[PDB]
Amino acid sequence: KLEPFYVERYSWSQLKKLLADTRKYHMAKAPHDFMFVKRNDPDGPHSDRIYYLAMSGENRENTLFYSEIPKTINRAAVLMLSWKPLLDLYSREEELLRERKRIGTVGIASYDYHQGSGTFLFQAGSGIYHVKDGGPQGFTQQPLRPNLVETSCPNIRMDPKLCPADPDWIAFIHSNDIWISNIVTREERRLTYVHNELANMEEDARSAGVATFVLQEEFDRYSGYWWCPKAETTPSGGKILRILYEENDESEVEIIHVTSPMLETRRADSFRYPKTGTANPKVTFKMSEIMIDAEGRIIDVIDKELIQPFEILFEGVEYIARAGWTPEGKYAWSILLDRSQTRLQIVLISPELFIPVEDDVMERQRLIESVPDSVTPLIIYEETTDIWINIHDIFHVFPQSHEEEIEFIFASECKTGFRHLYKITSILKESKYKRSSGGLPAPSDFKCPIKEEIAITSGEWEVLGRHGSNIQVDEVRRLVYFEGTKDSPLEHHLYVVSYVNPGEVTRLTDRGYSHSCCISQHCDFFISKYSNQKNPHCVSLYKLSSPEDDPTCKTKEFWATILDSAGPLPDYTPPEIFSFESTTGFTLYGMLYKPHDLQPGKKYPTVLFIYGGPQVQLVNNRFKGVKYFRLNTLASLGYVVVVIDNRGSCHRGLKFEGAFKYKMGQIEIDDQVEGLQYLASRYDFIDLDRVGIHGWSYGGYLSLMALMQRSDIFRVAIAGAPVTLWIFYDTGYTERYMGHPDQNEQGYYLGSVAMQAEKFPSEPNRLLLLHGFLDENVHFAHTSILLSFLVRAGKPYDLQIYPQERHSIRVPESGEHYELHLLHYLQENLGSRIAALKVI
Amino acid sequence: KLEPFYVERYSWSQLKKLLADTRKYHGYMMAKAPHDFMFVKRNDPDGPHSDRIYYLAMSGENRENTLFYSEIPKTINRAAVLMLSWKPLLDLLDYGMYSREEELLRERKRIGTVGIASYDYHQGSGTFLFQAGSGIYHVKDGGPQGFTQQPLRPNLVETSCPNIRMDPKLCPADPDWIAFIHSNDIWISNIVTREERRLTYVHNELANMEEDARSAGVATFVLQEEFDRYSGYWWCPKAETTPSGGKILRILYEENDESEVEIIHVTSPMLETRRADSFRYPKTGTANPKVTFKMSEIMIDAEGRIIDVIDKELIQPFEILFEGVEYIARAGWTPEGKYAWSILLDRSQTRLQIVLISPELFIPVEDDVMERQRLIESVPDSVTPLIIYEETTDIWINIHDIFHVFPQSHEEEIEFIFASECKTGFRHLYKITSILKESKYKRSSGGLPAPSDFKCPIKEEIAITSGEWEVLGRHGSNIQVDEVRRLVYFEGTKDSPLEHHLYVVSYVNPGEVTRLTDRGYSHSCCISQHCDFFISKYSNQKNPHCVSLYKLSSPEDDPTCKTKEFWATILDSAGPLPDYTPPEIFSFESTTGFTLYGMLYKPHDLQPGKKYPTVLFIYGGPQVQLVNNRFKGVKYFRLNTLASLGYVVVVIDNRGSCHRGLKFEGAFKYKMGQIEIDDQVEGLQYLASRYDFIDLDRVGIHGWSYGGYLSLMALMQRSDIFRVAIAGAPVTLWIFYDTGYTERYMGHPDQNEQGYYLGSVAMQAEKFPSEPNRLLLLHGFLDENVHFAHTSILLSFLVRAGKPYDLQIYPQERHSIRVPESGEHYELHLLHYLQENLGSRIAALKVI
Ligand SMILES: *C(#N)[C]1[C][C](F)[C]N1C(=O)[C]([N])[C]1[C][C][C][C][C]1
Ligand SMILES: *C(#N)[C]1[C][C](F)[C]N1C(=O)[C]([N])[C]1[C][C][C][C][C]1
Known part of the structure; x- marks a missing residue:
């Protein structure tokens, strides 16, 4: 055999300096949210102006910039475009949204634009602002001071959108109701009256125009209202604008308490958190119909509800995943899921399907009878799977050729097991169902026949439709x-x-x-x-x-x-990507960071960094020297570092992903160990007697499963923000991958770490639990309940809390302490001479 | 030099077994000794017994606390020793299955007993009343009905009330009637007729505590935690007869309004809920509850039926009649029932008053304004409160339970015994006679009374005791007067x-x-x-x-x-006990001018020429003395366990500790945390010069609550001396602690910014070590007394400052550790931490 390498035993202070010195040379947003605007100046040198969000440097605000695209270039040279700044200068609602969107940026996170006017609309903190560039008014050659949209509203205004039909009008959310505001006339008008800011959330659980927690956290839908892109002209010379919106009722959703960040207060905030197996919010669609006169004054606002209840019209739908309008505004559309997330429907919803809210019953009947039976919801697409629907942002609707026909591109994994693009043409027929007759519709009554469904793409590979990946269609x-x-x-x-x-x-x-x-x-x-x-x-x-x-x-x-x-970067050596042919039948990929100054005939302690959950791939050909820089740091101290994308991970198709359906925690470590054993047979420098594992969230979960299942292999486990009881996690994620708990009693048991606390080691210096105290995603209770059972079972543990942190680590001091403690724990309990010496 | 002794390095499993084996012989010892004694004469000239004694106790380990009797014989054989037989009074009621109100009370009272915690008795009838779990029960023994020779069936007081009934008391004037609290209101119930009646209507069970903060007859949190007052209502001991052949019974009660008290959230024990319970917690410098006195007047007919109930309020508001009073510390009645009395404190707890309150001072509650004036003018101006005693101090008033009122000789004179530290600086008994004059203040005239207007002159104030020593008046210690x-x-x-x-x-x-x-x-x-x-x-x-x-x-x-x-x-x-060696009590003359006492546990099988790791166990705060001549082999058994492993164990009562007089106690006024460790170190250094077996390079410190606080202060202030500190449930910010304790010892924070800063560990986080394996924090997650926030805020600053720490949480525990598994884990982790970071070879070897 070979002699063990021991990592140098640094003091805590020494390690702190070491980590500081290596961070000080080495977090700043790349350009994003691009938009191209034509110059339309035949004598000028530029074809286009591109606008984008970015950060100018480290510790600077995220803002709007522009660059000029020339008509021609010198092809002998490389053109560096100048970043010209477009502009000259947190609430609980902002904090939470930033948590749900996973954004560390300060300043402007997004913007809206209207081509015909050149109007930009954006939130910057407290304020909603607008400026013009690149419509009729022309193109600035210097930064613009924005204009504050005046308001009488006392609280933070969220989610501002320009009306695409009239850029004088905006909408926004305030205290969970929709308002509109005219940026020329200054008229401000509340549209919905479902929430009362003055009441306790415990009595007042209605909202309009907002996506609830599960939608933001598990489906990446942040908005709950959609402007109709066209205005209906009136005989008066006026017009009607329309807003489709989600109305939610969270009354039956469970209330949890999360520690308030203001620790001095010794208080806790209420959250509506739908845990696995419990009520999601009661949802419906509503429409606001806004009549405007000839000179932009509001005449009237009519709030409108579906002619029959959502539950009747959309049998079995639990979630509104996506919504919008067709390009002409003839129909609203929606993508709808059942609770088990195995049936998707794409549905067209005519405005004629909505009627005035009328509490008066004689008048309500008059309004119901006035809507013809021929006006029904139109399911233009339905698909099923034995695995799950992964929601995406791809859906393109063509202009209508015929009143009875709609043509669109959608994407799906349901035919082949890989996400591909399909062009579909569906027939818009009169339904067999007639409201008149006073019955309820059978499930198939709103299904449209499919005229044609052609595959645009096919093969053993996926089209991407999340995280800003979308299609662009050239008609x-x-x-x-x-x-x-x-x-x-x-x-x-x-x-x-x-x-x-x-x-x-x-x-x-x-x-x-x-x-x-x-x-x-x-x-x-x-x-x-x-x-x-x-x-x-x-x-x-x-x-x-x-x-x-x-x-x-x-x-x-x-x-x-x-x-x-x-x-x-000078103080950074990248990992090698490897692969191995697994006994499971798949090629699995990994990254190996070898120890730096690798001495021959010595074997080195090994750290397995892991995520291993759905929706993520760690191993790919991207630069890892920013986000996973400390993996390199570990290699510099003499740890072998390994990362493996187990089954369940992303970008390998639905079958690969589907491997852990109902079986979370049961398979992932087999793959991790298989990769580990592949490496160890190929490279004698891996000391399998000194293997550690570390991950955050799902990675924390798996780190616990690794120690619990495979203590023969893993000497130490360091689990950050672990899920320890899947019953505490939310509906949208948990039920997707694990079903309802009654239908998967053994899967919930075996996949829940805290139900199996007896399986932890009775030796200390092996288990380290890390958690953000204020985490509203993975509640601290996952950790505290685990510890409850560890104590009851007589087992040791180590604990670190980050009292000012939620799921993410945002405050730099918190991150510095995490990094320092991690390296020190590994030093003391895995890598050093003292670690091996203290082993009993 | 001497060679360092290294403790044997046990594995975690080994240590667990070791701890288990040493607890298994000493499992008999968790069992309550007889208490709450009462003597009743037999009055049987032919019988062999003078008295029957009744008391609460446990038969043995894993049995409930219940009522027993024993027979006291008229004569004894003085050649022999008589063991009295314990005859059970009851035919047994209480499992462990407590409501929130019971759990909290038990935390406040510090009671680990299951069963009957206390009882009431009425001499003239022989009626016992007691709560046993959910139920309120009665029996009769020792009255006209006679003396049982066998156990009695407990009789359940039936009810229509949906929730836990608390704080049952017999009416001393009519033992057919009891009172209790239900959902923060006073009820009465007749145990013969079964008539039940609500008296007060201030709380609504159906509302959220956030909107409904009134309560009647109950002591609020600070009173229970910081003054040992658990009750807020007092039966008048005598009944006034009516012309009808009926009677009037009376209850004095405190009515509280917690509307302005801060609401905190404490994690619900049901961790799966991911929820938190609301508590009214008056933090230092913020509002205590709005308090007043009220009186319920209950008219009973000739055959025991309630005719009417009249709720009565003070003729003028509490704030007017009792200028400057923050806390009602104690209350009750004179023996004849002519006057209610109260012991009343100002906010700073430097002024005590004893006040007599006539029933004539209360009038019917009346929303009608015409009728209210009629009622105000009907009360003579001569009827005012009577401050019979007032005292002040530059340190603090320590409340006690000593107060004895003699029978009235003269209508204009009252004679009583009270105890005070205010004259000499030690608590002594004083016989006082106060003059009950008509006040200068006349309500009629429509003004407000000046502070002195209700002060009674003192006719005589004679010291019954004096000296450099205290009379004890808390924790059950009281007086008995033979008239x-x-x-x-x-x-x-x-x-x-x-x-x-x-x-x-x-x-x-x-x-x-x-x-x-x-x-x-x-x-x-x-x-x-x-x-x-x-x-x-x-x-x-x-x-x-x-x-x-x-x-x-x-x-x-x-x-x-x-x-x-x-x-x-x-x-x-x-x-x-066979596997127990007690400590030696020692003393040393401190540079501070006081003799200070300590306990030393020497290592077992002490080898000559070796020096041993040392652990200082500490509390060091007010109201407590660790070092005295009592058996410590139950409560502090694990100090002996540590000694058996080869740790020297030290305990010292620093200045501020109890039973040494007010000057001694007063050493840390305004200055908490600044003095206590100097005394601890001085004792430690005294011992180390006297005993070369103490290795001063390897000293650890450990305590809970104030002890946790000081353990942190020791590491912060004296890292040269203390190698490791283990702090359980530490106060880290005095601004988070409550009004009643904190303001007593430290004053209001606005007037003592420097005291609060220097006394608050979390404001000084930079002073912790930059070496790991020195600081260990322990805390019950559900602690509603010392909130977990003390720990979480400390960690907030430790993280900000880049300092290492270790942490253990007890997720099922409050301030106390009650679940045995939690205690097993605590003990195990403590010994293992000490082993690995203080005592063993590996500990010294990992020091960098
Ligand atoms: C972590 N990771 C937590 C616990 C569980 F593993 C899932 N999880 C999440 O944060 C999810 N809500 C994320 C959804 C988007 C894809 C990453 C996980
Ligand atoms: C502990 N001990 C906590 C924190 C502070 F040190 C005081 N404290 C208490 O529990 C007090 N409420 C006790 C009052 C009665 C006597 C012991 C302390």
């Missing part, structure tokens, strides 16, 4: 731009394909990098944010053209750099 | 600050104090109401607690001269 050339894994599961690339006669898929991005892309609305440019394992993130602009002979065919030319990378 | 012989029996520290003893002295012509208990033991005593017997529960460092009965006589020539004879054993001790 002139009849093409669709999308991102996908076709070339490699370790790289994202941009592709184009014909939707009309689908065939050759053309890759637009270069191999050897993973890419995150944005296509211009005009379909003549795209941007790629790209990196690889060796090289930090860059952002570049590419011009799209087609040959004279064939408008279908697309080519790419480099145009300009928006963001140059820092070169390779 | 026939004109004597007062009391407990005190005259013979030694390490022993409590029973004393008697004349109140009429006070001189020589006679010690009745034997030297070499500390005593806790109960005197018979008849003053011809007493009981002592007594122990010392070498011997577990005994309970013995002693007969009192005087020679025919001199009733002042009291003698004692042993009569019988009630409880014999277990002998000395």
Whole structure:
């Protein structure tokens, strides 16, 4: 055998300096939310102005910038675009939204724009502001002082949107009701009256226009209202504007208490948290109909409800996943899920389906009878799966050729097990169901027949539709731009394909990098944010053209750099990606960080960093030197570091993901250990007697499962924010992967760490629990209940709390302490001479 | 030099077994000794017994606390020792299954007993009343109905009330009637007729505590936690007759309004709920409850039926009649029921008043304004409150239970015995006679009274006791007064600050104090109401607690001269425990001018020429003395366990601790945390010069609550001396602690910014070590007394400052540790931490 390498035993103070010195040379948002606006100046040198959000440097606010795209370039040179700033200068609601969106940025997080006017609308903290650039008014050559939208509202205004039909009007949320405001006339008007700010949340559980917790946390829907994009003209010379909105009633949702951040207060905030197996909010759709006169004064506002209840019209629907309008405004649409998340429906909802709210019963009947039986909801698409529906942002509706026909592109994993693009044409027929007759509809009564369903894409690879990945459709050339894994599961690339006669898929991005892309609305440019394992993130602009002979065919030319990378970082060596053929039948991928200054004939302690849950892939060809820089730091101290994407992880198709359905915690460690054993047979420097594991959230969960199941392999486990009882986690996530608890008694038992506390070791210095005290996602109770049972069972543990932190670690001091304590714990209980010496 | 002794390095499992094996022999010891004694005469000239004694006790380990009796014989064989048989009074009621109100009360009272916690008795009827779990029960023994020779069936007081009934009291004027609290209101119930009636309507069970903060008849949190007042209502001991052949019964009660008191949230025990309970917690410098007195007047007909109930309020508001009073500390009635009395404190707790409150001072509650004036003018101006005693101090008033009122000789004069530290700086008994004059203040005239207007002149104030020693008046210690012989029996520290003893002295012509208990033991005593017997529960460092009965006589020539004879054993001790060596009590002359006492547990099998790791166990706060001549082998058994492993164990009562007088106690006024460790170290250094076996490089410190606080202060202030600190339930910010305790010792925070800063660990987090394996924090997660926030805020600052810490939480525990598994884990973790970071070879080896 080989002699063990012991890591150098630094003091706490020494380690603190070491970590400080290595952070001080080495967190600043790359450009995002791009939009392209044509200059339309035939004598001028620029084709387009691009607008984007970004941070200028470290410790600077996220704001709007523009850059000028020239008509031509010098192809001998590389053009660096100047960032010209567009502008010249937290509530509980903001804090929580930032937690749900996972945003560490200070300042402007998003913006709205209206092409025809050039009006930008954005929140910046307390205020809602607007400015004009790039419509009729023209293009600024310097930063603009914005205009504050006046209000009489006492509380934070959230979720501002411009009316696409009239950019004088905005909507927003205030104290969970919808308001509108005219930015020229200054008229302000409340539309919904479902919440009372003055009441306790315990008595007042209604809201309008907001996505509730599970929707923000588990489906990435943050808005609950949608402007109709067109205005209906009136005989008076006026108009009608429309807002579709979700109305929620959380009355029957369980109330939990989370410690208030103001620890001095010794108080706790109420949250509506739908735990697994308990009531989700009672949802419905409503519509606000807003009549405006000839000079922009409101005449009247009519609040309208569905002609029959949501539960009757949309049998079995638990969640409104997505909603919007068709481009013409003829129909509202929605993507709807059942509770088990195995049936998706895409449904068109005519405005004629809504009637005035009328508590008077004689008049209500008059209003019900006035709506014809022919007006029904139209299920244009329905799919099922034995695994789960993964919601995405891809849904493109074409202009209507015929009143009785709708054409759209959607994406789905349900046919083949990989997400692909499909062009569907559905028939809008009169339903067999007639309200008149006084019955209830059978489930199939609103289903439309499918005329055609053609696959645009196919194969053993996915189209991406989350995290800003979407499609862009060119209706002139009849093409669709999308991102996908076709070339490699370790790289994202941009592709184009014909939707009309689908065939050759053309890759637009270069191999050897993973890419995150944005296509211009005009379909003549795209941007790629790209990196690889060796090289930090860059952002570049590419011009799209087609040959004279064939408008279908697309080519790419480099145009300009928006963001140059820092070169390779000097105090950072990347990991090697490896793979192994698993006994499970899949190729699994991993990353190996070898120890630095690797002495021959010595074997080194090993740390397995792990996530291992759904919706995430760790192993790919992206730069890891920012986010996973401390994995490199561990390697520099003489730990082997390993990361493995087990089954259940992302970007391998639905079957791969589906491996842990009903069985969370039961399979992931088998893969981790298999990878570990693959490495150890190939590399004698891995000391399998000194293996540690660490992860956060799902990673914390698995770190516990590893110690509990495989104490023969894992010497120490360091579990951050672990799920320890799946019954405490929420409906949307838990039930998706694990079903209802009654239908999976053994899965809930075996997958819940805290039900199995007897299986922990009776040796100390092996288990370390870390948790943000104020975590409203994974409640501290996961940790406290575990400890309750550990104590009852006579087992040792170590604990660290981050009393000012939620799920994330936001305050830098908290992160410095976490990093320091982690390295020190590993030093003392895994890597050093003293660690091996204290083993009993 | 000397060689360092390293403790044996046990594994966690090994240590667990070791701790289990050493507890298994000493599982008999968790069992309540007889208490709440009462003597009833047999009055049987042919019978062999003079008295029957009744008391609460446990039969043994894992049995409920219940009522027993024993028979006191007229004569004894003095050649023998009589063991009294424990005859059970009841035919057994209480499981462990408590409401929130019961749980909280038990936390406030510090009671670990299951069963009957207390009882009431009515001499004239023989009626016992007691709560046993959910139920309120009665039996009869010792009245006209006679004396049972067999156990009695407890009789359930039936009810229509949905919720737990609390604080049951017999009406001393009519033992057919009881009162209790239900959902923070007063009810009464007749145990013969079964008539039940609500008296007060201030609380609504159906509302949220956030909207409904009124309560009647109950002591609020601060009173229960910081003044040991659990009740807020007092039956008038006599009934006023009506012309109809009926009667009027009366209850004085405190009515509280907690509307302005801050609401905190404490984690609900049901952790699966992920919820938190609301508590009214008056933090330092914020509002205490709005308090007043009220009176319920209950008219009963000739055959026991309620005719009417009239709720009555003070003729003018509490704030006017009792200028400057913050706390009602105590209350009750004069023996005849002519006056209610109260002991009243100002906010700063530097002014005590004893006030008499006539029933005529209350008028019917009346919303109608025309009728209210009629009622106000109908009360004469001559009827005012009577402040019969007022005292002040530059330190603090320590509330006690001593207050005895003699029968009234003259309508304009009242005679009483009270106890005070205010004259001499030690608590002593004073016989006072106050003049009840008509006040200068006249309501008619429509003004407000000046502060002095209700002060009664003092006719006489004679000291019954004096000296450099205290009379004891808390924790069950009280006086017994013999009005026939004109004597007062009391407990005190005259013979030694390490022993409590029973004393008697004349109140009429006070001189020589006679010690009745034997030297070499500390005593806790109960005197018979008849003053011809007493009981002592007594122990010392070498011997577990005994309970013995002693007969009192005087020679025919001199009733002042009291003698004692042993009569019988009630409880014999277990002998000395076999796997236990007690500590030595030591003392040293401090540079501070005081003698300070300590306990030293030497290591077992002490090898010569070795020096040993040392653990200082500490409390060090007010109201407590650790070092005295009592058996410590139950409560502090694990100190002996540590000694057995090879730790030296040290305990020292620093300045601020109890039983040394007010000046000693007052050493830390405004200055908490600043003095206590200097005394601890001085003692430690005294011992180390005297005993070369103490390794001063390897000293640890550990305590709970104030002890946790000081353990942190020790590491902060004296990291040169203390290698590790283990702090349980520490106060880390005095601003988070309550009004009643904190303001007493530290004043209001606005007037003592420097005191609060220097006394608050969490404001000084930078002063902790930058070395790990030195600080360990322990806390009950559900603690509603010392909130977990003390720990979480400390960690907030430790994290901000980059300092390491270790932490253990007890998720099922409040301030106390009640679940045995929690205690097993605490003990295990403590010994293992000490082993790994203080005592062992590996500990020294990991020091960098
Ligand atoms: C962590 N991770 C927690 C506990 C459980 F593992 C899931 N989880 C989450 O934060 C989820 N709500 C996230 C949904 C988006 C994909 C990452 C996990
Ligand atoms: C502990 N001990 C806590 C914190 C502070 F030190 C005082 N304290 C208490 O529990 C007090 N409420 C007790 C009052 C009665 C005598 C012991 C202390």
